[PDB]
Amino acid sequence: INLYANFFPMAHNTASTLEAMLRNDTNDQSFNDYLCAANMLYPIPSNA
Amino acid sequence: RPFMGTWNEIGT
Amino acid sequence: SLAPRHGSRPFM
């Protein structure tokens, strides 16, 4: 098994100004899970 | 920020 | 358009 990553050859002068600019606490990146679940399974006996 | 794909004054 | 709604060329 081999991992694989594809890099955007960002210009260094601007990539470095992205680190010191996206690393800021204020600009952190926050996601969400689409399904927004609280999954729970409840058994049911046959013919119930 | 002139990184865009300027058409005639910056910005798509 | 224009403002009496839709149309075209009686406005230059």
């Binding site: 955007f8 050859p9 | 794909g5 300027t6 058409w7 | -």
Partner: protein, 49 residues
């Protein structure tokens, strides 16, 4: 029976492309390496195989 696998990628109706940009992306009509002086305002040869 023991088996040896084969493959292809039949891909018709399209022409292979290679943008002439540094990132390989589609930045605009006039590429970012179609205006970089080393390739315009100068001469060059070409040699593919």
């Amino acid at each position: 029976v023991p088996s040896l696998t084969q493959k292809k990628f039949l891909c018709d109706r399209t022409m292979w492309r290679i943008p002439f940009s540094s990132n390989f992306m589609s930045m605009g009509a006039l590429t970012d390496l179609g205006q970089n002086m080393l390739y315009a305002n100068s001469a060059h040869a070409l040699d593919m195989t």
